[PDB]
Every structure is written in C-alpha cells, then in structure tokens.
Amino acid sequence: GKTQKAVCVIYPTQDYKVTGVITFTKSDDGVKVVADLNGLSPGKHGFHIHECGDCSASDGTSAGGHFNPEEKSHGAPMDMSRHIGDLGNITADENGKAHLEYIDKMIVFEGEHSIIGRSMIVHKNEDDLKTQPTGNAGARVACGVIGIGK
Amino acid sequence: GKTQKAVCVIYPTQDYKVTGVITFTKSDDGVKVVADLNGLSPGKHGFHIHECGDCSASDGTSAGGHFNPEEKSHGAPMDMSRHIGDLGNITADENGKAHLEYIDKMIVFEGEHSIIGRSMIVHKNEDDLKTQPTGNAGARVACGVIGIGK
Ligand SMILES: [Zn+2]
Ligand SMILES: [Zn+2]
Ligand SMILES: [Zn+2]
Ligand SMILES: [Zn+2]
Ligand SMILES: [Zn+2]
Ligand SMILES: [Zn+2]
Ligand SMILES: [Zn+2]
Ligand SMILES: [Zn+2]
C-alpha cells in the first residue's frame, strides 16, 4: 500500500565519523522526523534532504544541491519560501550525540515531492536559514539515502 | 525529468567488511546493472533487491524479504519465474574484489515495480536460484539503499 515510513542510515564522508539513523513516519499533521546521530562536533549542523540519492563521492558532493522540486529559495522549515529539503539544523551535545524530533508539513513519500530515493546530508556548520543557496552550512560530514520502511 | 540512473552504496552488516557501489542505468535493451564491491570472501554471493530500504539492523534483517511486487517465485535473473529483486550472484576474486555487469529487463525506476528506495543485500553464500523463497544464500553481509542518480 502507501508508504507510511521512510528510513535513512547516514554514513560519514572522508575525514568524519558522523553516523546515525533518521526515520520519517506519517502523522495526523504531516511527517514526524526523528534523528539520532553521533560523532558530530558540538553545536548546530545543517540537516537537509539533497536532490540525488548518490552517496558515492568521498565528500558527499554526488548528493547534489538541496531537494527543490518547487524551485524555491533556501529557508527554515517554518518558512513558506524553503526547499522541500530544508529541515533546518540538528544540535549535537558535548559528547557529539544529536537527537531531533519535529513534524514537517511539506515532506511526502509519493508523487513529484517524494523524498524516497533522495539523500540526507548533515553539514559541518550551522544552516543560517537565510544565505542562498545552502544557508552557508559548508562541508558534508555524512550522507545517506532515504529508503522505504515498514 | 524521468529517473535514468539509480545508485546504491553498500555498507557492511556488523560482522563483515563488504563495501562497494552499484549503479543502474537505463539502456535501449533494459537496465544496465554495474556492481563494484570489495571485502567479500572469494566465490559466489547472492545479490538481491530486498523490499525495505532499511539498513538500520545489525544483521541487515530490517531490509525484509525479496522485492517481489508481482508475488512470484524466487529464481535466476534470466527466469520468467523470478522476483523483481532476483539479480542472481556476484563473484568475488581471490582478493575479495567483485565486479558484475548485466542487462536486467524487469527492473524500472517508476511505478509499482520501481527499485528506488528499496535495498541491495549481498549474502554470505551463493543464491542456488531454485530454493524457495530466497535461494538459501544465508546471512546478509552488506546492505544499501537504492537512490536517484543525476
Ligand atoms: Zn539516541
Ligand atoms: Zn544541505
Ligand atoms: Zn535549502
Ligand atoms: Zn514538480
Ligand atoms: Zn536476499
Ligand atoms: Zn528472490
Ligand atoms: Zn564489466
Ligand atoms: Zn503492484
């Protein structure tokens, strides 16, 4: 039937140790994003869906730009002017552990906007939610492909 | 634009070291499957698309069973009686390097049979191409999710 769940295991790019799992679950109000990552420098990291489910490059550049089927500007999750892939920042604690849970009202699992087969990228720096086209989040520290869950 | 290419980076399950990249490219005659893997025990390894793009489990069991949207029997790539996910065996050389190239006439990138967001599983043992429902290929040595390529 209709995909209710997506799963993304992220793997570090060259010179990083960032790992973890992101799950996407259909909720009444949209899609519940739950991320559990480790090996991050403490503080805020850009947390995005990129347009290619291609994590073959050593530095994650194969994932391409932000997933942007609506051809909009880069912004914050709460902005109307955002990429579908703009999931904001994930915060790592003093031990490099990062937990995020929020409800996204734009991401879907079917049709032109479907995130299935796209990539998750975690960035080295904070997404400032304003600078075009990526929020100045800098290098890619981890990459994974979003798959169909059950 | 219609997806012309899919990419799958495989990562080992916990007790293994198997890595590599699999590409799927639309050709005139079907889909060209190209696999380049390393860290395999020499000999033949079951090489399958599984139904869930979920590589979160320690042992790859999260990937579920064979991708089988037609509800058919397990077989060889050349068989009419096969799962969409039945891509046969990949052979590793004496150094653990494995190359496979063949044209698959069943796998597609859109609709009910789409392999996008499904998993690749590499098995410890040979797929015997006959035993139901999995070809008796034994443990899962590597898992990856099939993503959209540029
Ligand atoms: Zn946790
Ligand atoms: Zn990004
Ligand atoms: Zn963006
Ligand atoms: Zn569109
Ligand atoms: Zn299998
Ligand atoms: Zn099968
Ligand atoms: Zn070849
Ligand atoms: Zn069907």
Numbering used by the authors:
A (entry chain BBB), B (entry chain AAA): 4 to 153
Task: Quote the passages of the study that discuss this structure, keeping the authors' original sentences.
They employ redox-active metal cofactors to catalyze the production of molecular oxygen and hydrogen peroxide from superoxide. Crystal structures of a Bacteroidetes bacterium CuZnSOD portray both prokaryotic and eukaryotic characteristics and propose a mechanism for self-catalyzed disulfide maturation. The Group 3 CuZnSODs described here and exemplified by BbCuZnSOD represent an evolutionary intermediary between E-class and P-class enzymes with high eukaryotic sequence identity and E-class homodimerization but P-class functional loops and disulfide configuration.
To investigate, representative Group 2 and 3a enzymes RbCuZnSOD (OUV78940) and BbCuZnSOD (OFX46851) were purified recombinantly from E. coli. This yielded zinc metalated proteins with negligible copper as is the case for human SOD1. Figure 4 indicates that BbZnSOD is able to form its intrasubunit disulfide bond rapidly in isolation in contrast to SOD1 and RbZnSOD. As the disulfide forms, BbZnSOD transitions from monomers to homodimers indicating BbCuZnSOD forms an E-class homodimer through an interface incorporating the disulfide subloop and that it may follow an autonomous maturation pathway. Immediately adjacent to Tyr14 at the loop I N-terminus, Pro15 replaces a glycine which is conserved in 80.5% of eukaryotic CuZnSODs (Gly10, human SOD1). As a result, loop I adopts a conformation shifted toward the disulfide subloop.
